[PDB]
């Protein structure tokens, strides 16, 4: 949630997506470490990062 404003985050692995734990292996109830950005050269004027 809205954690400490000044801090460093190096988190990874699914944050308990489902009831069963990830058990160190990806798959169900497990998500990728970080979703992918990638705006196109021309995708909206006020939309680029």
């Amino acid at each position, epitope marked *: 949630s809205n954690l400490k404003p000044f801090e460093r985050d190096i988190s990874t692995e699914i944050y308990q997506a489902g009831s069963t734990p990830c058990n160190g292996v990806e798959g169900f*109830n*497990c*998500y990728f470490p970080l979703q992918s950005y990638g705006f196109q050269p021309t995708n909206g004027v006020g939309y680029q990062p």
Partner: nanobody
């Protein structure tokens, strides 16, 4: 009874590609653990893939890496499953499930998918 319509099941040649789709009858319009499970002949249920409704997270099993693509639509409230280069062992009955928050597992009728020459 959390109705889930299925489509796309049918016969396919070896190493083919189908167009599968599953749509949910509302289901609270919010799911957390949607995934696809299958039951092969002389075998039991096993994980295949899972995708997130609140985001773009996609989860795939070891044998369905890359070749299979799963995407969910928030506007039409349905899941589209696309695949390529299937193997004979893939013959099994698929199922689409919608996991609601803090509720048991929902299931549908599924479809029969057969691959052979």
């Amino acid at each position: 009874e959390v109705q889930l319509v299925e489509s796309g099941g049918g016969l396919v040649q070896p190493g083919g590609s189908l167009r599968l789709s599953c749509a949910a009858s509302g289901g609270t319009f919010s799911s957390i653990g949607m995934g696809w499970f299958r039951q092969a002949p002389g075998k039991e249920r096993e994980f295949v893939a899972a995708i997130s409704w609140d985001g773009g997270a996609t989860a795939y099993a070891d044998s369905v890496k890359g070749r299979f693509t799963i995407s969910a639509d928030n506007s039409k409230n349905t899941a589209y499953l696309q695949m390529n280069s299937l193997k004979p062992e893939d013959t099994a009955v698929y199922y689409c499930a919608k996991e609601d928050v803090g509720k048991p597992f929902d299931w549908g009728q599924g479809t029969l998918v057969t691959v052979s020459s």
